[PDB]
Coordinates of C-alpha atoms in Angstrom, one line a residue:
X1 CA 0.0 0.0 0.0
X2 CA 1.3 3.6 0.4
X3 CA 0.2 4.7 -3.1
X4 CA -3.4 3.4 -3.0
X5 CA -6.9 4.8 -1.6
X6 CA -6.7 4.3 2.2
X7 CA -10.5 4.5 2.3
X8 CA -10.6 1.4 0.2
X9 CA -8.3 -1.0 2.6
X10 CA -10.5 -3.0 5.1
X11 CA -9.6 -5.9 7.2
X12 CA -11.9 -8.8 8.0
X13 CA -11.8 -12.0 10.1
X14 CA -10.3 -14.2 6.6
X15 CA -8.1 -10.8 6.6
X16 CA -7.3 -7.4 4.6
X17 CA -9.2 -6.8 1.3
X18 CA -9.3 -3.8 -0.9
X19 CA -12.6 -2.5 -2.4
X20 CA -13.2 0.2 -5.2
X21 CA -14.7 3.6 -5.4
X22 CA -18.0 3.8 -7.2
X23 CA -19.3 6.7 -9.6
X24 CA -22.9 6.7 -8.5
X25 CA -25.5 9.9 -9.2
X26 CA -24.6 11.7 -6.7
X27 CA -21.1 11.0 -6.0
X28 CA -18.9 8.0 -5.2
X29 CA -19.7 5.0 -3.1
X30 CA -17.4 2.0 -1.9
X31 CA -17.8 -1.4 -3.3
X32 CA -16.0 -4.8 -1.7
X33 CA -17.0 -7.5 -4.1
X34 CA -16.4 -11.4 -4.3
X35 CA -15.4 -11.1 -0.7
X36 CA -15.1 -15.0 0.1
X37 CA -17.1 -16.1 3.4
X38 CA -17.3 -19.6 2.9
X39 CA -14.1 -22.8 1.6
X40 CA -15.5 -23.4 -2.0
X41 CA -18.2 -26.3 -1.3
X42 CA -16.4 -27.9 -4.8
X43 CA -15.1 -31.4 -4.9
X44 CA -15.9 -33.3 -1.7
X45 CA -18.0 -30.4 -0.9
X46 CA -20.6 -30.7 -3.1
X47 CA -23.8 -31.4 -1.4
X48 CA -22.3 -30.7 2.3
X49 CA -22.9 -27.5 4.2
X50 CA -20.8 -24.9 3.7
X51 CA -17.7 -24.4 6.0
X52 CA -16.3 -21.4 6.9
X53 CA -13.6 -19.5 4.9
X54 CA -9.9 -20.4 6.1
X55 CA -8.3 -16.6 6.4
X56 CA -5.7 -15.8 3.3
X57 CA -2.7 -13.8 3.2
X58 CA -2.1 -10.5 1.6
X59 CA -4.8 -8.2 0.4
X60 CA -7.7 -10.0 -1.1
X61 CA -8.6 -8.0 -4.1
X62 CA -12.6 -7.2 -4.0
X63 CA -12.8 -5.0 -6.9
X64 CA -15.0 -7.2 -8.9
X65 CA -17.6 -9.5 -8.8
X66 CA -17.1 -13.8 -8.5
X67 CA -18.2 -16.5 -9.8
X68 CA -22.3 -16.8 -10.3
X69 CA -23.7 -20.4 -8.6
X70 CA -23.7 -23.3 -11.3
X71 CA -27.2 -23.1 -12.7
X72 CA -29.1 -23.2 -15.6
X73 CA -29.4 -20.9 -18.2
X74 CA -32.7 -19.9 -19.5
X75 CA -33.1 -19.3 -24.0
X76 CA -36.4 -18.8 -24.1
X77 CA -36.2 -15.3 -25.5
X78 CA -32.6 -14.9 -26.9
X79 CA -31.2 -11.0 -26.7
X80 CA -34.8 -10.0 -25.3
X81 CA -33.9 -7.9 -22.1
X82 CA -36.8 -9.1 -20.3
X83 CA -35.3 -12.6 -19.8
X84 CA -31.7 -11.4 -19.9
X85 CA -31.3 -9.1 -17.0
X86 CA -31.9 -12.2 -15.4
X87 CA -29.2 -14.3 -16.5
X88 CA -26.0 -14.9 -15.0
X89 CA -23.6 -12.2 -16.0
X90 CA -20.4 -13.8 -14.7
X91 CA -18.7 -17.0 -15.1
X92 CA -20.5 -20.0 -14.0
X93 CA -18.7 -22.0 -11.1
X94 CA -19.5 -24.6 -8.3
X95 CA -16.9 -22.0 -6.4
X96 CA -19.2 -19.1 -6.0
X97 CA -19.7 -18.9 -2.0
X98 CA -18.7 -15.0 -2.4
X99 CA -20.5 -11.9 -1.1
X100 CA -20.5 -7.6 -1.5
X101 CA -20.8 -5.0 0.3
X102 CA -21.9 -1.5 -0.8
X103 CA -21.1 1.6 1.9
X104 CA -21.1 5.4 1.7
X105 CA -17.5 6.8 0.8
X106 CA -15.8 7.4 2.7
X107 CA -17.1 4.7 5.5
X108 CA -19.5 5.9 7.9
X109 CA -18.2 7.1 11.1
X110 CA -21.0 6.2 12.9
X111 CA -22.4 2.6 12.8
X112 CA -25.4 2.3 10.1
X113 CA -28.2 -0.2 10.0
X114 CA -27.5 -3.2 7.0
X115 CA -29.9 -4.0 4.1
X116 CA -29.3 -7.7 3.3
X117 CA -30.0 -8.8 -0.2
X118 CA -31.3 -12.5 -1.4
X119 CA -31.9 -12.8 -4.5
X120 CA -34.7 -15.7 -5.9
X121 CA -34.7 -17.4 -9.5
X122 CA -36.8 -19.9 -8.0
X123 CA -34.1 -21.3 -6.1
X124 CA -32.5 -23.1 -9.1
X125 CA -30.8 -19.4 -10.4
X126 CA -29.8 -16.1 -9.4
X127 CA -26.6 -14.0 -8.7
X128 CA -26.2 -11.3 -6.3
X129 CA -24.0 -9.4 -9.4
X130 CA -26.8 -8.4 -11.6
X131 CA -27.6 -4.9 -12.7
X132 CA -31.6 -4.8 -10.7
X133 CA -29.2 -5.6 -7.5
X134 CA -27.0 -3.1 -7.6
X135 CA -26.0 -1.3 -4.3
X136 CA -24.6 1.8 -5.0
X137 CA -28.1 3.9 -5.4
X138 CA -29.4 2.8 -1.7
X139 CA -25.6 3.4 0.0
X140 CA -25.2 6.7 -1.5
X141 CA -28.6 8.2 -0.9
X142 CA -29.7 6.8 2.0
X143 CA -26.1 5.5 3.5
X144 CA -26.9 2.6 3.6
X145 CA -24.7 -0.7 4.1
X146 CA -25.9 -2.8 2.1
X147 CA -24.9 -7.2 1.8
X148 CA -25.4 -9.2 -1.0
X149 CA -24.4 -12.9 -1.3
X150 CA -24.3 -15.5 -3.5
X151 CA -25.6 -19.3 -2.3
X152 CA -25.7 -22.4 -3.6
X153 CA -28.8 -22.9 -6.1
X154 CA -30.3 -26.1 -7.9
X155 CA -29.3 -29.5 -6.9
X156 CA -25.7 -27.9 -5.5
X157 CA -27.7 -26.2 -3.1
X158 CA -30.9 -28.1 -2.7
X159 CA -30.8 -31.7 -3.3
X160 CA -31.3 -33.7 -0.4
X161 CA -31.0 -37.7 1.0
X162 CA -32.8 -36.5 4.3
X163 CA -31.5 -38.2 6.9
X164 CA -28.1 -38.6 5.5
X165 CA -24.7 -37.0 6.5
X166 CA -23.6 -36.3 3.3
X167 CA -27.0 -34.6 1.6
X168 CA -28.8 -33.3 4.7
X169 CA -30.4 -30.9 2.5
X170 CA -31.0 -26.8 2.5
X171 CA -27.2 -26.3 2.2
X172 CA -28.2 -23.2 0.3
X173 CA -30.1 -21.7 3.2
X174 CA -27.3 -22.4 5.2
X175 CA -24.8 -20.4 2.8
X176 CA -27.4 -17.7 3.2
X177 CA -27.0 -18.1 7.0
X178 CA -23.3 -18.5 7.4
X179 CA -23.5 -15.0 5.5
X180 CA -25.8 -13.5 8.1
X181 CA -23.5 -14.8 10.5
X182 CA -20.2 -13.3 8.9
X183 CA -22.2 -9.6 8.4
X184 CA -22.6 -10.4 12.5
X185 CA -18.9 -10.4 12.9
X186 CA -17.1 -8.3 10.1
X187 CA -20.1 -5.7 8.9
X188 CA -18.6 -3.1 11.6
X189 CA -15.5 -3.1 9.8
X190 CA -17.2 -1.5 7.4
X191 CA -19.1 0.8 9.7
X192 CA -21.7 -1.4 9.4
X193 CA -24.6 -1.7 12.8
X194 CA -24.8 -5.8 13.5
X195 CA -27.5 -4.8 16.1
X196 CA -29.3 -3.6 12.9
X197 CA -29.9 -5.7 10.2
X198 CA -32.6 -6.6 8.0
X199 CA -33.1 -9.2 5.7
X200 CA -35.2 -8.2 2.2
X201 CA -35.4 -10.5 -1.2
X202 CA -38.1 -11.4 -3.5
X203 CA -39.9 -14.0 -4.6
X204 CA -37.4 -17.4 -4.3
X205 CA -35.4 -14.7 -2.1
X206 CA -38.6 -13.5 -0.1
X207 CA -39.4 -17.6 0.4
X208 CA -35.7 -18.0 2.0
X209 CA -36.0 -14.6 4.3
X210 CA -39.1 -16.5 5.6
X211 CA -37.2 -19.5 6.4
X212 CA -34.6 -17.7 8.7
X213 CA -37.9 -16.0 10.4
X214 CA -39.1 -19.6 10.9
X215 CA -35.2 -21.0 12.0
X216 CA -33.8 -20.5 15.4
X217 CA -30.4 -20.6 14.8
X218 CA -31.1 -17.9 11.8
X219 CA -33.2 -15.6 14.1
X220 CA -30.0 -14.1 16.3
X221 CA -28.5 -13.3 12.9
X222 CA -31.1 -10.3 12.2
X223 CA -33.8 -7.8 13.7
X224 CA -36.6 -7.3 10.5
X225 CA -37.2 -8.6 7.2
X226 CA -39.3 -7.8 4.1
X227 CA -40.2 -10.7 1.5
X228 CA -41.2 -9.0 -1.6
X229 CA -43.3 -11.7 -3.6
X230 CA -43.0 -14.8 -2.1
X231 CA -43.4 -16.3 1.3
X232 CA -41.7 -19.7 3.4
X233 CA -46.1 -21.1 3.2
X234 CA -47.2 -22.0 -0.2
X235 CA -47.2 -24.5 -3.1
X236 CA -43.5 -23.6 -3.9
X237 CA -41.0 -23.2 -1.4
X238 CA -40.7 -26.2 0.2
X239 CA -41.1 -30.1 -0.2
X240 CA -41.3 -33.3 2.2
X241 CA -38.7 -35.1 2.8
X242 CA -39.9 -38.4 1.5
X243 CA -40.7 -36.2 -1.8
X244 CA -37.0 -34.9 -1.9
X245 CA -35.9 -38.3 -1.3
X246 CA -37.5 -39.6 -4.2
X247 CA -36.4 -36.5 -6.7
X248 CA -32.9 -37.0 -5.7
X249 CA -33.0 -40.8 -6.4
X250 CA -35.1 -40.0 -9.7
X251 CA -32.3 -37.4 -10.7
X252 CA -29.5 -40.0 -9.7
X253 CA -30.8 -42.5 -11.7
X254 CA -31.2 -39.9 -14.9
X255 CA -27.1 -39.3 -14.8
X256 CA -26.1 -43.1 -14.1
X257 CA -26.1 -43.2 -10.4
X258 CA -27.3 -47.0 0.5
X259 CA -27.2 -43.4 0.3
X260 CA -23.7 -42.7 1.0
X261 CA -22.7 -44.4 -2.7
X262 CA -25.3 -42.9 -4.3
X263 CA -24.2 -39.2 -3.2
X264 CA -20.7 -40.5 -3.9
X265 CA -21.7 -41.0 -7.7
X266 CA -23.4 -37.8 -8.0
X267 CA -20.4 -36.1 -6.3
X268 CA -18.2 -37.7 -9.3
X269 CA -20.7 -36.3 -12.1
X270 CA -19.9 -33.1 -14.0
X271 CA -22.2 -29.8 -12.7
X272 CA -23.6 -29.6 -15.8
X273 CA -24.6 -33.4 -16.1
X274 CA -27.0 -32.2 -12.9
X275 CA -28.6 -29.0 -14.6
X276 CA -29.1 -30.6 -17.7
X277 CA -31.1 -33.3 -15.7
X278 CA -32.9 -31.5 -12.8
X279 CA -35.9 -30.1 -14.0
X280 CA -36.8 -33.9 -15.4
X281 CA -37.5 -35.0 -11.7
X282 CA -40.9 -33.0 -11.1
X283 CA -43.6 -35.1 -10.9
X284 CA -45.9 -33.1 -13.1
X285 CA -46.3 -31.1 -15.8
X286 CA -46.6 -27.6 -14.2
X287 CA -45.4 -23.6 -14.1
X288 CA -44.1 -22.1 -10.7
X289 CA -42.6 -25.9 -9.5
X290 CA -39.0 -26.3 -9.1
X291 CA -37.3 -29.4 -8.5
X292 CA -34.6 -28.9 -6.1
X293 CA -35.9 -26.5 -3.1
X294 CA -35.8 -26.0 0.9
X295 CA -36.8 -29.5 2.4
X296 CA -38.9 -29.7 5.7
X297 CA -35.8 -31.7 7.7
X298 CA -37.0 -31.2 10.9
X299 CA -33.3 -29.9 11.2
X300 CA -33.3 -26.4 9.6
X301 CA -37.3 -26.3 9.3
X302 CA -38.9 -28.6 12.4
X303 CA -42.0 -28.6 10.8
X304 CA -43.5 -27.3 7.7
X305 CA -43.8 -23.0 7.2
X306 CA -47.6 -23.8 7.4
X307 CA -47.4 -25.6 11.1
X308 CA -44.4 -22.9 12.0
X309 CA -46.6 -19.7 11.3
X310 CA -49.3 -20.9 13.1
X311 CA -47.9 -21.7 16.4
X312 CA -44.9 -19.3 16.2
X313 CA -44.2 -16.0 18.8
X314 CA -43.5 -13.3 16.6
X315 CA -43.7 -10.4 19.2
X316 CA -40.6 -8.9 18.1
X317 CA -40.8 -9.4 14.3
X318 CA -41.4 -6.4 12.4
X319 CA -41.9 -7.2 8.3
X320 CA -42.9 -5.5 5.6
X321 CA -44.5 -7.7 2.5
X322 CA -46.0 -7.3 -0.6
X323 CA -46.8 -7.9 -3.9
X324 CA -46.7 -7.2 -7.8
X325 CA -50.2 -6.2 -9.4
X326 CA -49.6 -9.3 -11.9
X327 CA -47.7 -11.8 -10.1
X328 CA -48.8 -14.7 -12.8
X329 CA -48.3 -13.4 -15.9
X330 CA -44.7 -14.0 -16.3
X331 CA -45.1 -17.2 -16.0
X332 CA -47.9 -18.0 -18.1
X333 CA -45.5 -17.2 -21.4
X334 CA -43.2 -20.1 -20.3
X335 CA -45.3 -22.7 -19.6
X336 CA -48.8 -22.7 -20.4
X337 CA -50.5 -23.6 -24.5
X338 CA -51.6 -20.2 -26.1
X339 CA -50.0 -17.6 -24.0
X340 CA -46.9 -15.8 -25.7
X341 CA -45.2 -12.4 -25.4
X342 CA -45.4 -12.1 -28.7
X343 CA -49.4 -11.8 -29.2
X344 CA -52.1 -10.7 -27.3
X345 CA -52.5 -14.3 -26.1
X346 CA -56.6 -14.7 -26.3
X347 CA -57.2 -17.7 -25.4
X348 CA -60.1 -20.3 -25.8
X349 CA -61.9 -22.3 -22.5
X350 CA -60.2 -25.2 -23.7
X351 CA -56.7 -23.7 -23.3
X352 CA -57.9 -22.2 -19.7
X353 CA -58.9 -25.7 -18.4
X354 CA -55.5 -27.0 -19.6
X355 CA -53.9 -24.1 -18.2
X356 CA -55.2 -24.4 -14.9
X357 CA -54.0 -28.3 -14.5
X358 CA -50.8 -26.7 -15.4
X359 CA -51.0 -24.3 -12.9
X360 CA -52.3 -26.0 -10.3
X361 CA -50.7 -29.7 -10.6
X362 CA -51.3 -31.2 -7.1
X363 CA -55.0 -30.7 -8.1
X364 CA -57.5 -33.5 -8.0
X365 CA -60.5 -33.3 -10.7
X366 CA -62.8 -32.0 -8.6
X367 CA -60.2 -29.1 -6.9
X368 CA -59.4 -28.2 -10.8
X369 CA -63.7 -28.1 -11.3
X370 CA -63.9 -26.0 -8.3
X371 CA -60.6 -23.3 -9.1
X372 CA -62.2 -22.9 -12.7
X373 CA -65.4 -22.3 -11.3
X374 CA -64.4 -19.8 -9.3
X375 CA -62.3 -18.0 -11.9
X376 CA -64.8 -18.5 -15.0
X377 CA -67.0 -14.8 -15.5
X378 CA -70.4 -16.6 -16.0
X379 CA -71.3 -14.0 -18.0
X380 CA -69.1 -14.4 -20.2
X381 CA -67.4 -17.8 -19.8
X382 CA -65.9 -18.1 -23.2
X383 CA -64.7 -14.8 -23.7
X384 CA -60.8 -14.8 -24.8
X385 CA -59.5 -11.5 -22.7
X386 CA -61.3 -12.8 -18.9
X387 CA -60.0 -16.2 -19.4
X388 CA -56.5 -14.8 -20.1
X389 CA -56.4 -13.0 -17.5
X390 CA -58.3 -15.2 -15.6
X391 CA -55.5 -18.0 -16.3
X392 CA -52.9 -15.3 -15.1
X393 CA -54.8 -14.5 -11.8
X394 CA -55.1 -18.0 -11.3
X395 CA -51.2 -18.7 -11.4
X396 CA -50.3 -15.6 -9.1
X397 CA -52.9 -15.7 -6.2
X398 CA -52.6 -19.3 -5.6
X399 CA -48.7 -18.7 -5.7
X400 CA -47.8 -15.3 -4.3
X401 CA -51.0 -13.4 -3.3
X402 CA -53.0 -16.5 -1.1
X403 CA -49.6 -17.0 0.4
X404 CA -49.0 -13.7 1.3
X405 CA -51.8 -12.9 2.5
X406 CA -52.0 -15.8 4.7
X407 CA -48.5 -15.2 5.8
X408 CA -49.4 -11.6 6.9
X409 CA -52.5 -12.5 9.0
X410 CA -50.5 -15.2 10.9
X411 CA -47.5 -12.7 11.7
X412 CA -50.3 -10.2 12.9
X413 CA -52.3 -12.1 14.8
X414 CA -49.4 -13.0 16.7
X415 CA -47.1 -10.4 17.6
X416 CA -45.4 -8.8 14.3
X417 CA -46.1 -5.9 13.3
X418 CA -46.3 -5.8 9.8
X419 CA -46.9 -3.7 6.8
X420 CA -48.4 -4.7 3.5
X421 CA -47.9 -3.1 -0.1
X422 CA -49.7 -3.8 -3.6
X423 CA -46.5 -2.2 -6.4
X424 CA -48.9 -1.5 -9.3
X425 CA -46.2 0.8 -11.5
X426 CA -45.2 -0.9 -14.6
X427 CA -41.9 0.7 -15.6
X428 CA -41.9 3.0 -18.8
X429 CA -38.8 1.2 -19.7
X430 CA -40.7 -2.3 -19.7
X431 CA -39.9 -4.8 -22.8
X432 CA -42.8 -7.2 -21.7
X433 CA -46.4 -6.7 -23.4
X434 CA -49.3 -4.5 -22.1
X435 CA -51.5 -7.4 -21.1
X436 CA -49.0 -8.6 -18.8
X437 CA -49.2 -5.9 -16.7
X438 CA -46.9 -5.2 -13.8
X439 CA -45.0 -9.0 -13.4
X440 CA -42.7 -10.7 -11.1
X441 CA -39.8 -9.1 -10.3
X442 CA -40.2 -5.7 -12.1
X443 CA -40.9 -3.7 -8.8
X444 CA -37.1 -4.6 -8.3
X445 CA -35.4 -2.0 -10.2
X446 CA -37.4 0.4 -8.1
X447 CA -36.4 -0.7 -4.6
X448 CA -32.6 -0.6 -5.5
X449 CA -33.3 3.0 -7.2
X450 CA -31.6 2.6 -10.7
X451 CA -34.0 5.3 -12.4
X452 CA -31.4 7.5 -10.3
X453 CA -29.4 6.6 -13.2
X454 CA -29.9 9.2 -16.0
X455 CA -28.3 7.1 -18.2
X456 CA -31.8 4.5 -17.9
X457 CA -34.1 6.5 -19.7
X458 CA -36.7 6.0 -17.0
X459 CA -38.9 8.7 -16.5
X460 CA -38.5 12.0 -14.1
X461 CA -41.6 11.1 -11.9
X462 CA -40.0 7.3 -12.4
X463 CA -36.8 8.9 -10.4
X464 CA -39.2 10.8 -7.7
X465 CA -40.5 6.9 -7.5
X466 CA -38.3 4.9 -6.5
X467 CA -36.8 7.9 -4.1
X468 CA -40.1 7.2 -2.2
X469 CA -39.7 3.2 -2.3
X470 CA -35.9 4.0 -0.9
X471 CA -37.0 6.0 1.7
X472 CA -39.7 3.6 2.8
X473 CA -37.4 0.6 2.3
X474 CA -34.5 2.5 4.7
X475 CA -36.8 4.1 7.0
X476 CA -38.4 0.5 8.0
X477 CA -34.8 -0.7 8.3
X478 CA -33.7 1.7 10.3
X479 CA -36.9 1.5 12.8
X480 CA -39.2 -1.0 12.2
X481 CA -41.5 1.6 10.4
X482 CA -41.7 2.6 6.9
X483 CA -43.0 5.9 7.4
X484 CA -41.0 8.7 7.4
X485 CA -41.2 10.2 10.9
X486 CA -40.7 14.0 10.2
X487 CA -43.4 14.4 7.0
X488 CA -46.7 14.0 8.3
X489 CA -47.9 16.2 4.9
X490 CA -47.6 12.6 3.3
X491 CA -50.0 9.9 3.7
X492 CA -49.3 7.4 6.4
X493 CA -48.9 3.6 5.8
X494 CA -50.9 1.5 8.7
X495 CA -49.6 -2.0 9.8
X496 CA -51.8 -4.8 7.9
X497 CA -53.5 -6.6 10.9
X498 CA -56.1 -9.4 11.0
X499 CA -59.2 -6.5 11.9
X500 CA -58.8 -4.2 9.3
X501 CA -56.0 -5.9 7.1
X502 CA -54.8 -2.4 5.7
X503 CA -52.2 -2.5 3.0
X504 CA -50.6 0.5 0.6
X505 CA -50.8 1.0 -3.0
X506 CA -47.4 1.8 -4.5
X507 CA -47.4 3.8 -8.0
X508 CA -46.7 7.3 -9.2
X509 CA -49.7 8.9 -6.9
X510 CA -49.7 9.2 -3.3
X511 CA -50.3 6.3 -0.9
X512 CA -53.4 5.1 -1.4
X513 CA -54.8 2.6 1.4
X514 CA -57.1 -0.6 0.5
X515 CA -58.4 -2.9 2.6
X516 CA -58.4 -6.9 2.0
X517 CA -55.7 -8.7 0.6
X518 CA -58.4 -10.5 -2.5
X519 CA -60.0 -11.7 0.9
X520 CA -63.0 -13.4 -0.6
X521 CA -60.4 -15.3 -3.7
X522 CA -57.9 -16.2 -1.1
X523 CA -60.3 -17.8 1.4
X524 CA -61.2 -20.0 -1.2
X525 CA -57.2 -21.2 -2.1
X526 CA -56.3 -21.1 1.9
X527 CA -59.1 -22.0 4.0
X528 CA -61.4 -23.8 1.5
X529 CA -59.1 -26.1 -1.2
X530 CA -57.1 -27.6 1.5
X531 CA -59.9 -29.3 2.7
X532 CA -61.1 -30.0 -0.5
X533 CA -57.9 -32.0 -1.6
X534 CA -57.6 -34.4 1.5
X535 CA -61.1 -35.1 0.7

C-alpha cells in the first residue's frame, strides 16, 4: 500500500481486502466485491454444508464480482432484455460462495443499520452481481450498508437424501446463513450496525428470508425482514422429505447413479450433467414448481412453514411484505398452450382448463372443477380476454398473493407488526407486453433506485418513484416503520392486521390505502381447497 486509496483497505476476520470507489449519481460509493465467506463447497464439498472461509494472506482483491452459482441458463427469449437481465452475467462455477458490500465513501463514522440482499430465481438461479441488485443507489442516498451474497442454487444447493450425513439438504439456506453470520462479525469493519440488520429479497429470495424467520439458529442473525413476492407457506418453497428423497433418487438415476454411494456418484458427475437433468425430476407437468428446493428436515425447518406460522411467537418481528399487481403473468408465457409475449394471447376455454391443471398440478378433478369455477366470468365464460387474465390470476394468487396474505394475517395475529404493499407501477422502460401488466420481479429495479441513473431513460416522476420506495425501504430498516417520521404532509402507511387488514398502493400517486388482501379469492385457495384436496 502507500500509493493506494486508504478509504478502500478494510480488514476482516479471513483478513485485509481492498474494495473500489463507485461513480454513483450523486457522488462515489465504496464497493467490496467477491469477498469469500465460505471454503469453495467444490469437490468433496458438493452437497455438504458450507464451511467457513480459512483466512488468506495478503490483500484480497474485491474489486469485482465472482463467480455466479452453477445453474441453468434460461433461452427462451434470446437477446430480449426481459429474460436477460436475469441471467447470469459472470462466469459459472460450483466455487461461487462470495458476497459484497456497498457503503457510503468514505465509510461511515457512525455505525449504520445493514440492508441484506437474497436474491430468488426460484431457487434453481440467481446471482447477487446483476444490474436490478445493484448497491450503489441505496448506499449513496440513503447511506446505507448494504450485503449481497451468492448461495448455492439447484441441486448444489438443494438436493437432499434427508436423513443422510452427506446430503442433509437446505445447504443453500445455510450459505445464506453462514452470511448472516459473517455480516454479525465483520459488517462493523465497514461501519456497518450488527445490532441492525434486516433481511429483504423477493420471490425465491422472499421464500428464503421467511425461512430464517421460521429458524432459530437464523433468528439471532437479524432484527426485521421484508419478503417482496414470495413467502416460506405456499405450493413452492418447500417439499417433504420423503418427496426430496424420491427427486434425488429419480435425478441420480437420470445421470447413471445405501445413500452414501449414491451421493458418492453424484459427487463424481460433472455440474452440468446435474442442470441438464434437474428439471426432469418434477412429478408433473406444471409452471411455478422447481425441483430442487428447501426440504422440511425437521433440522433447519422442524416442521412445515404452514405448522411454523401458526404456532410461532413473533412479538418482536417487524416485516414489511407485498406484492406485484400481476404476479402470474410471467409465467404463463413459459409454460402454459396459447399464452406468448409475442401476441395478445386470447385464449379459448379449452386452453384455460388446460392451463389451470398446469398451474395448479397437485390438483385432484374435482379441486381443478372447483378453481375454474371460481375463476370463470359466467357471464361471459368463453370470452378470450377474462380467461387470459383469468388463467394469469389463477397462477399468481394461488402462488404469491393466497400465500401472502396468509402469511401476513398469521404474523399479525401473533405479535409482528407488519406492513403490507400492492406495487402497481409498470416501468416505462418495460420490454414485456401491455396485457402482462406489472410481473414478477419488475418492482425490483425500483427498490434498489436505478432510475437514479440518467443514463436508464426512465422517467423524471420514475426517479421521484423509487426515491419514495428508498426512503420507505430505509426508514423500515432503520426503525421498524416505513413511514417517514418527520413528513406528516404525506399519507401514512398503517400495519396490515387481521381486523382491518390495511395495506398500501405503490405507483406514481400518493399512498393510497385498500383494505383486503383478494379476501374473498384467497379464502377459497387457503381455508377452503385444503380441505377439498384431503377429501
Amino acid at each position: 500500500e502507500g500509493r493506494e486509496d486508504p478509504q478502500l483497505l478494510v480488514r476482516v476476520r479471513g483478513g485485509q481486502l481492498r474494495g473500489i470507489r463507485l461513480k454513483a449519481p450523486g457522488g462515489p460509493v465504496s464497493a467490496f466485491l467477491g469477498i469469500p465467506f465460505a471454503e469453495p463447497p467444490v469437490g468433496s464439498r458438493r452437497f455438504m454444508p458450507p464451511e467457513p472461509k480459512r483466512p488468506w494472506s495478503g490483500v484480497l482483491d474485491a474489486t469485482t464480482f465472482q463467480n455466479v452459482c452453477y445453474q441453468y441458463v434460461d433461452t427462451l427469449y434470446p437477446g430480449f432484455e426481459g429474460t436477460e437481465m436475469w441471467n447470469p452475467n459472470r462466469e459459472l462455477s460450483e466455487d461461487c460462495l462470495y458476497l459484497n458490500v456497498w457503503t457510503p465513501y468514505p465509510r461511515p463514522a457512525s455505525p449504520t443499520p445493514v440492508l441484506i440482499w437474497i436474491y430468488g430465481g426460484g431457487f434453481y438461479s440467481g446471482a447477487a452481481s446483476l444490474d436490478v441488485y445493484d448497491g450503489r443507489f441505496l448506499a449513496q442516498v440513503e447511506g446505507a450498508v448494504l450485503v449481497s451474497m451468492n448461495y448455492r442454487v439447484g441441486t448444489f444447493g438443494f438436493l437432499a437424501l434427508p436423513g443422510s450425513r452427506e446430503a442433509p439438504g437446505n445447504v443453500g439456506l445455510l450459505d445464506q446463513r453462514l452470511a448472516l453470520q459473517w455480516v454479525q462479525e465483520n459488517i462493523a469493519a465497514f461501519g456497518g450496525d450488527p445490532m441492525s440488520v434486516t433481511l429483504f429479497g423477493e420471490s425465491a429470495g422472499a421464500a428464503s428470508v421467511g425461512m430464517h424467520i421460521l429458524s432459530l439458529p437464523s433468528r439471532s442473525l437479524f432484527h426485521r425482514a421484508v419478503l417482496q413476492s414470495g413467502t416460506p407457506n405456499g405450493p413452492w418453497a418447500t417439499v417433504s422429505a420423503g418427496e426430496a428423497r424420491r427427486r434425488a433418487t429419480l435425478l441420480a438415476r437420470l445421470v447413471g447413479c445405501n445413500d452414501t454411494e449414491l451421493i458418492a456418484c453424484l459427487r463424481t458427475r460433472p455440474a452440468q450433467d446435474l442442470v441438464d437433468h434437474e428439471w426432469h425430476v418434477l412429478p408433473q407437468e406444471s409452471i411455478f414448481r422447481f425441483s430442487f428446493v428447501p426440504v422440511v428436515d425437521g433440522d433447519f425447518l422442524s416442521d412445515t412453514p404452514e405448522a411454523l406460522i401458526n404456532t410461532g411467537d413473533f412479538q418482536d418481528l417487524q416485516v414489511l411484505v407485498g406484492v406485484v399487481k400481476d404476479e402470474g403473468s410471467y409465467f404463463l408465457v413459459y409454460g402454459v398452450p396459447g399464452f406468448s409475449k409475442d401476441n395478445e394471447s386470447l385464449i379459448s376455454r379449452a386452453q384455460f382448463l388446460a392451463g389451470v391443471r398446469i398451474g395448479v398440478p397437485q390438483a385432484s378433478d374435482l379441486a381443478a372443477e372447483a378453481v375454474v369455477l371460481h375463476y370463470t366470468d359466467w357471464l361471459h365464460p368463453e370470452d378470450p380476454t377474462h380467461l387470459r387474465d383469468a388463467m394469469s390470476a389463477v397462477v399468481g394468487d394461488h402462488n404469491v398473493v393466497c400465500p401472502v396474505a396468509q402469511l401476513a394475517g398469521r404474523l399479525a395475529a401473533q405479535g409482528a407488526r407488519v406492513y403490507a404493499y400492492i406495487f402497481e407501477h409498470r416501468a416505462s422502460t418495460l420490454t414485456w407486453p401491455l396485457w402482462m401488466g406489472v410481473p414478477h420481479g419488475y418492482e425490483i429495479e425500483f427498490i434498489f433506485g436505478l432510475p437514479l441513473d440518467p443514463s436508464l431513460n426512465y422517467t423524471t416522476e420514475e426517479r421521484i418513484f423509487a426515491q419514495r420506495l428508498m426512503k420507505y425501504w430505509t426508514n423500515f430498516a432503520r426503525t421498524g416503520d416505513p413511514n417517514d417520521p418527520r413528513d406528516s404532509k404525506s399519507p401514512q402507511w398503517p400495519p396490515y392486521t387481521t381486523a382491518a387488514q390495511q395495506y398500501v398502493s405503490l405507483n406514481l400517486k400518493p399512498l393510497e390505502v385498500r383494505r383486503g388482501l383478494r379476501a374473498q379469492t384467497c379464502a377459497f385457495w387457503n381455508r377452503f381447497l385444503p380441505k377439498l384436496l384431503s377429501a
